[PDB]
Amino acid sequence: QCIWWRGLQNAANVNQTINNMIALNTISYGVRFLKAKLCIEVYAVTRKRLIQTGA
Amino acid sequence: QCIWWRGLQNAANVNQTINNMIALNTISYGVRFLKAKLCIEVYAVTRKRLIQTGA
Numbered sequence: 001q002c003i004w005w006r007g008l009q010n011a012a013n014v015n016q017t018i019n020n021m022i023a024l025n026t027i028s029y030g031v032r033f034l035k036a037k038l039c040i041e042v043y044a045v046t047r048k049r050l051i052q053t054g055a
Numbered sequence: 056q057c058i059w060w061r062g063l064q065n066a067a068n069v070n071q072t073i074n075n076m077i078a079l080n081t082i083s084y085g086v087r088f089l090k091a092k093l094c095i096e097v098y099a100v101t102r103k104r105l106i107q108t109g110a
Contacts, residue, residue, distance in 0.1 A: 016082065021083065026078065
C-alpha cells in the first residue's frame with residue numbers, strides 16, 4: 001500500500017535501480033508504476049524449541 | 056571530426072537532448088555513438104549585389 005519498493009526501511013538499501021529512478025524522476029514530467037512483482041523466498045523455517053522442566 | 060553535436064559554439068544551444076545525455080553519461084560506464092545524421096536546410100541564397108559607378 002505504501003511505497004517500500006525503494007527500500008526505505010534502511011537507507012542502506014539503495015541500488016542503482018533507485019539511482020536510475022531518481023535521475024529519471026528529474027528528467028521526467030510524469031510517471032506510471034506499470035507492474036510491481038514481489039517474490040518471497042524462504043530459506044529456513046526455524047522455531048525456538050523450548051524445553052521446560054519446572055522452574 | 057570534432058564534436059559540435061552538443062552545439063558548443065554557443066552555450067545557448069542546449070536542449071534536453073543534451074541534458075538527457077548528461078544524466079546518461081553519469082549513470083553510464085560507457086557509450087557508443089551509433090549514428091550521426093546531419094541535414095542542412097537552405098532557406099535562402101543571398102548575394103550582395105554591388106552596383107559600382109566610378110568612385
